[PDB]
Amino acid sequence: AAAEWISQQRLSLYRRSERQELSELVKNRMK
Amino acid sequence: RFMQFRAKDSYSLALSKLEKRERENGSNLAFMFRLPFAAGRVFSISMLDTLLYQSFVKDYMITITRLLLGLDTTPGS
């Protein structure tokens, strides 16, 4: 049933905005 | 034409005449009949220029290319 979670994340990363992209890039560098 | 060059080869040397004839008829695809390009051994980046110029007439062309290349991932594509 892992494919259901994969699909849930797939739609989430598709819907995510550029501001979220820039925010996560900074947070990845910080951590 | 210089990707895999067999100078002692009549076939690859005859392809020069064919490509010159296509270049005579005004064909933009004259490199097409070269064996390395036809086999996928070479491609040129100037093609992406044609993709951009084509996008003035085909606004979907860039999207289709990236979907085939996997560059953009749309769910259900």
Curated annotation (Swiss-Prot), chain A:
Disulfide bonds: none annotated. It is found in: Cell membrane. Phosphorylated by protein kinase C. Phosphorylation of the C-terminal domain increases channel activity. It comes from the Eukaryota. Highest expression in liver, brain and spinal cord. Lowest expression in skeletal muscle. It is linked to Developmental and epileptic encephalopathy 14: A rare epileptic encephalopathy of infancy that combines pharmacoresistant seizures with developmental delay. This severe neurologic disorder is characterized by onset in the first 6 months of life of refractory focal seizures and arrest of psychomotor development. Ictal EEG shows discharges that arise randomly from various areas of both hemispheres and migrate from one brain region to another. Epilepsy, nocturnal frontal lobe, 5: An autosomal dominant focal epilepsy syndrome characterized by childhood onset of clusters of motor seizures during sleep. Some patients may develop behavioral or psychiatric manifestations and/or intellectual disability. The phenotype is more severe than observed in other genetic forms of nocturnal frontal lobe epilepsy. Homotetramer; which constitutes the Na(+)-activated K(+) channel. Interacts with KCNT2; these heterodimer channels differ from the homomers in their unitary conductance, kinetic behavior, subcellular localization, and response to activation of protein kinase C. Interacts (via C-terminus) with FMR1; this interaction alters gating properties of KCNT1. Interacts with CRBN via its cytoplasmic C-terminus. Belongs to the potassium channel family. Calcium-activated (TC 1.A.1.3) subfamily. KCa4.1/KCNT1 sub-subfamily. The cytoplasmic gating ring domain of the closed KCNT1 channel harbors multiple K(+) and Zn(2+) sites, which stabilize the channel in the closed conformation. Under low-Na(+) conditions, the abundant cytoplasmic K(+) ions stabilize the gating ring domain in a closed conformation. KCNT1 contains at least two Na(+)-sensitive sites in the RCKs domain where Na(+) binding induces expansion and rotation of the gating ring that opens the inner gate. Sodium-activated K(+) channel. Acts as an important mediator of neuronal membrane excitability. Contributes to the delayed outward currents. Regulates neuronal bursting in sensory neurons. Contributes to synaptic development and plasticity. This is Potassium channel subfamily T member 1. The gene is KCNT1.
